Subunit: 133 residues, 6 copies
C-alpha cells in the first residue's frame, strides 16, 4: 500500500469505559533541576490540552470526547530526570492510547521549552504506555 | 534564566529587542519496535496505510502548530521544514530527523523537536495494532543556528 | 497555597447522559453616538458578533484548559440594542445531550460576541466597557 | 443509526500537468497522500470551518484520488460515516473541496490557471 | 514540483526571495434552483443571513489556509476581502475574494480557500432546501506576487 | 472592506494594557488563597489560559489580523476587600497592527478560566468590567 491513508471504521463497536496510562521522561543535568515546583502547571496544562487535540495532531485519529485527563509530574534527583505519567479515560467506541502518548510527549516538550535556556541538550525519552483498559 | 517570570509565574518574554537572524534547528527521534513490527512498514502491510508519508506530513503540520501546542512559545513563521523518516532494521527502529529554519527573533528548537515527536507519535498510531509496547525515544536536538544564545552541534 | 502547579480535570464518565442547558448574558456599554452608529448605519455588525460567539462556543474546550470536549447540539446568540442605556445586550443559549453542562460555552459565546462588537466599534470609541458577563440560567 | 455520505471533486489541468503526477509516480506517492491526509483532517474540522455546523464524532473518513488522463483531470471521491444524530454531507464536501485544494497547491507552480469543479454530493 | 527529489514531502525554503506585496483574486460559483437563489435575496433561509455568514466564514478560512493545507507556509494576511453576489440569469451565487500581504511567499491558497469555504457555507445554509447544489467552478483570477498573472 | 488593509503601516512598537474583574463570594476568594478549589491551581491555569488566548485572538475575532506577539503578561491579584480577582494584561509586539484585542481577549479568557475553576462553589460569579487601560503606538491611558 503506497501513498494511502486509511482510517479504521469504528461504527460497529460497543460503548465501553476505556482507559490508558502512558509515561515519558525528560533527562537532564543534575543542576538543571533548579525547580520552581508554576513551571509544572504549564506542562500539566499542555498535556491536557494536547490530549484534547490528538485527533487534530495525529492524522488518522478519531475525534473523541474525553471523560477525564490527568497529567502528573515528578522530579527524580537520583536519576537526573522528570517523570511524567498520564491518564486518559472515556466511555465510547475508541480507546485513548494516542491521547495519553500525546499528553505525555507534549508535557515533556513543555518542560524542555521551560528549561531550554539552561541546557541546550536534554534528552526526552523513553515515551511508552504502562497499561490500558 | 528561564521561560518563567521574575516571580514564580508564567509570562511571555519580550524578544523584540534582539537581532533578527536566519535561525535553524535540527532534532532527532527514534521509534523502537519489534522486527516484525518494522517489517510490515517496509512491506506496506499495516492496514492503516503509508506510514512514512503520513508521519512525514503530520510532523510538518505539527511543526506549524508548535507555538499553539507549547503554551508559552512565541508565534513564528517557519520558512522551511524537513521531516525525514528512515528504517533501521539493524536496531529495530525508525530514525527520524527534522529540520526547521526561519528568520525571526526567537529560536526554533521547539518546532524541530515537535515535528520529530509527532512523526514518532504518528508512526506509533499507524502500527500500534500490531505492537502495543513500542518505545518512543530518544528525542534530542542535533544542532542550532542564528541564536544569540550558545549555538550547538552533534 | 496548597495544590500549587496542579491541574485536575473532573471525571465525568459516571454521570448520566441527559439534555443540559445554559443561558448567559453580556453587555457592552458605549457612548450614544457609537450606539447610533450600529442601529442607524445593524446586520453586518451583529452577524459578525453572532458568528464569532457561535464558533467561539464550539471551541470552549480549546480555550478553557480544564473543560471537557463536548459536542454542542444548539448555539444561539441574540444581539439587542438598548438606547436607554447606551449599550448592547448579548444573550446566548447552549444546549446538548451529554455528561457535561454547557455553562462555559454559553459564557464564552457571550464573551467573544462582546469582544467582537468591541473590535467593530473600537475606532469610534476608545473606552467602551464590557460587562457584566454573568450566567442567566442552567438546566442539568 | 448508521448515517453515511459520499462527495466528489475534480481538479482539471493540462495533460502535461497530470503527467507530472503520474510520470514520477507521485500519484501513488506523497502528492496524493497529502491530499488524502488534508481532506481527512479537513473533514474532522468541518464544524470549525462552517459556522453553522455541529462538531461530530466521525466513524470513518475516506478520500480516494484517481487520475483521469482521459479527461485531463484528477478525480476525487470522499466518504464520511457515523452513528449519530447528524448527517455528514458537509463533512464529505469539505473533505472533497480541501482535498482538491491541496492538489492545486502541489501543482500550483507548474500551471497558474487550474480549475476546480464540479464539487457535488452523490 | 512542491515536494522532494526523494519523492518525499517537504516544505520549500523561500526565505531568500524578496519581501514584496503579493495579491490574489479568486472566483467561485454555487449553482442552485431559482427559488433557492431568491431565498438568499429575500433572506428567508431559516439559518440566517447567508451572504454575511458566508463572508465571515471565508475571511476566517483565509486566516487558516496554512493550517488547513498541509505543506503551505504560515503567513500574516494584511487584507482579506470576501464578496458575495447573486446572479439570477445563471441560477447561481458568484463569489469573488481578495487576499494580499507583504511577504516572501504568495497568497493564492488564501484566496482559493476563502472562495471554497464561502461556497461550502452557502451550500450549508441552503442545504435543507436543496441537496442538488453544485459548487464550481473555483479558479484563480489574478496574482501580483513576486514569483504577475491575469 | 471591513477587514482593514494594515499594509502598509509603519513598523512600530505597539503595546496594550487591559483589565478585567471576576467578582465572587468571599468563601470562593478564600478557597483560591487556600487553594482548596478542586480543579487545581486557579491562578496558574488562568494565567496560562489567558496567554494562549492572546496568541489565538486572530482566530477568535473574525476581523482581526494575524500577528506575532513578543510579550504577553497575565497578572492575577486577589482583592479580598472587594470580593474579586483583578486581572491586568500587557501585550506588546513590533508590527503594523495594534494589540488591544489581544490584551482584552487574554484578560477575558483568564477571567473565564477563573470562573471555570471556581464555578462548582459558586454558580453566580459575575465577570466584569472588561476595559482597556492603555495602548501605546496616537497614545492613550486612563
Ligand atoms: N483518537 C484516537 N483515535 C483512534 C485511536 C486512538 O488511540 N485515539 N486508535 C486507533 C486504533 O488503531 C484502534 O484502536 P482501539 O483502541 O482498539 O479503538 C479502535 C481504533 O481506533 C483508532 N482511532
Ligand atoms: N465544555 C465544558 N466542560 C466542562 C464544563 C462546561 O461548562 N463546559 N463544566 C465543568 C464542570 O465543573 C462540571 O459541571 P457539570 O454541569 O456537572 O458537568 C460536568 C462538568 O463539566 C466540566 N467541564
Ligand atoms: N457538521 C455538520 N453539522 C450540521 C450538518 C452537517 O451536515 N454537518 N447539517 C445541518 C443541517 O441542516 C441538518 O442536517 P441533517 O443531516 O438533517 O442533520 C441535522 C442538521 O445538522 C446541521 N448541522
Ligand atoms: N490581531 C489583531 N488584529 C487587529 C487589531 C488587534 O488589536 N489585534 N486591531 C484592529 C483594528 O481595529 C485596527 O487597530 P490598529 O491598532 O489601528 O491597527 C489596524 C487595525 O487592526 C485591526 N486588526
Amino acid at each position: 500500500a503506497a501513498g494511502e491513508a486509511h482510517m479504521v471504521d469504528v461504527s460497529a463497536k460497543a460503548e465501553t469505559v476505556r482507559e490508558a496510562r502512558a509515561e515519558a521522561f525528560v533527562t537532564m543535568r543534575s543542576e538543571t533541576l533548579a525547580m520552581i515546583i508554576d513551571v509544572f502547571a504549564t506542562a500539566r496544562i499542555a498535556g491536557i490540552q494536547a490530549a484534547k487535540r490528538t485527533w487534530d495532531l495525529i492524522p488518522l485519529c478519531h475525534p473523541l470526547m474525553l471523560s477525564k485527563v490527568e497529567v502528573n509530574l515528578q522530579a527524580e534527583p537520583e536519576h537526573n530526570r522528570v517523570r511524567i505519567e498520564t491518564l486518559c479515560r472515556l466511555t465510547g467506541k475508541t480507546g485513548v492510547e494516542m491521547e495519553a502518548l500525546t499528553a505525555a510527549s507534549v508535557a515533556a516538550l513543555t518542560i524542555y521549552d521551560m528549561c531550554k535556556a539552561v541546557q541546550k541538550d536534554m534528552v526526552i525519552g523513553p515515551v511508552r504506555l504502562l497499561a490500558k483498559s
